[PDB]
Amino acid sequence: MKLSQDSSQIELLKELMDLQKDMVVMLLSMLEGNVVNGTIGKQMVDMLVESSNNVEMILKFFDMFLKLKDLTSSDTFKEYDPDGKGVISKRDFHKA
């Protein structure tokens, strides 16, 4: 939340998102030999239930950044400006 809001925090945000990817690769590769009602899946269900309140935050944080390129490649973001080389004013971004 708070790192994605400044200029010179983007390098540390690179660091933390790479650690994020390695943590989910870890427990995904832990998850690989489930049976159906495996104990390890039930453990992971319990730690997703216990940590629900902030997986809230990270999934909303991803939904607000997939819908970005759902928008800006298609509708009219590239079409307000005639050049289309990365210039849009802040009210010109808000009103879109």
């Binding site: 708070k2 790192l3 400044d6 925090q9 390098e11 540390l12 660091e15």
Partner: protein, 48 residues
């Protein structure tokens, strides 16, 4: 993990889980230190 032939097995995998837990809690209690101040310094970045 199991260390079959030897006398007293040392399960190294629960030990590296314990080191991951110690690094986690020190990360979380660095975060609570920076939770209010909201402008991370150069020292905070280079350490973090």
């Amino acid at each position: 993990r199991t260390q079959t032939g030897n006398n007293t097995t040392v399960n190294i995998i629960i030990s590296t889980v314990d080191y991951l837990l110690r690094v986690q809690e020190s990360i979380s209690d660095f975060y609570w230190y920076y939770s209010g101040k909201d402008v991370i310094d150069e020292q905070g970045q280079r350490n973090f």
